[PDB]
Amino acid sequence: DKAACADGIAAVKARVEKLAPEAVPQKLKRALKIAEREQGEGEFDECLEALDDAKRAL
Amino acid sequence: DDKAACADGIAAVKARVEKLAPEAVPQKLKRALKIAEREQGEGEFDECLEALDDAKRALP
């Protein structure tokens, strides 16, 4: 889960870098923020939950 | 789908590689990542996933 959380944050960040700032959905930006915080608390299992929501907004 | 997993996996391997000392990045990783990116550009997303598996296997 630790590697999947880090890989998923990298994957979401890469998608966001290609989008126009106004074209980044608010739901995507919030979900990624939650994932990065959950990673910071070592809750890698929850990080994956937040990452699922982020990808829904792609 | 495979298209999304291919892009996500390339992004994930690139971020892992950026954390390593350059001398610790094996030639086997570099070749596999190059193949994954070429296959992605050709729409061969299933083959890209295979090359990404080789790349991640070669990481320290």
CA angle in degrees (0–180, nearest 5) for A46-B6-B17: 75
In angstroms, the CA A4 to CA B12 distance is 9
> Is B7 within 8 Å of A13 when comparing Cβ atoms?
no
Taking residue B23's Cβ as centre, other Cβ atoms within 10 Å add up to: 6
A13 touches chain B (CB under 8 A): yes
Nearest CA in chain A to B5: A11
To one decimal, the resolution in angstroms is 1.6
A14 touches chain B (CB under 8 A): yes
B5 touches chain A (CB under 8 A): no
Contact A8, A38 (CB under 8 A): no
Contact B54, B28 (CB under 8 A): yes
Q: Which helix (H) or strand (E) holds A45?
A: helix A44-56
